[PDB]
Amino acid sequence: LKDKKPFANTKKTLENQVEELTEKCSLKTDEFLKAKEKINEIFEKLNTI
Binding site for another protein (CB under 8 A): 6-7, 10, 13, 32, 39, 43, 46
**Gap between the Cα atoms of 19 and 12, Å rounded:** 11
Min CB(18)–another protein separation in Å: 12
Q: What's the alpha-carbon Rg for the chain, to the nearest Å?
A: 21
User: C-alpha 6: how far from its chain's center?
Assistant: 28
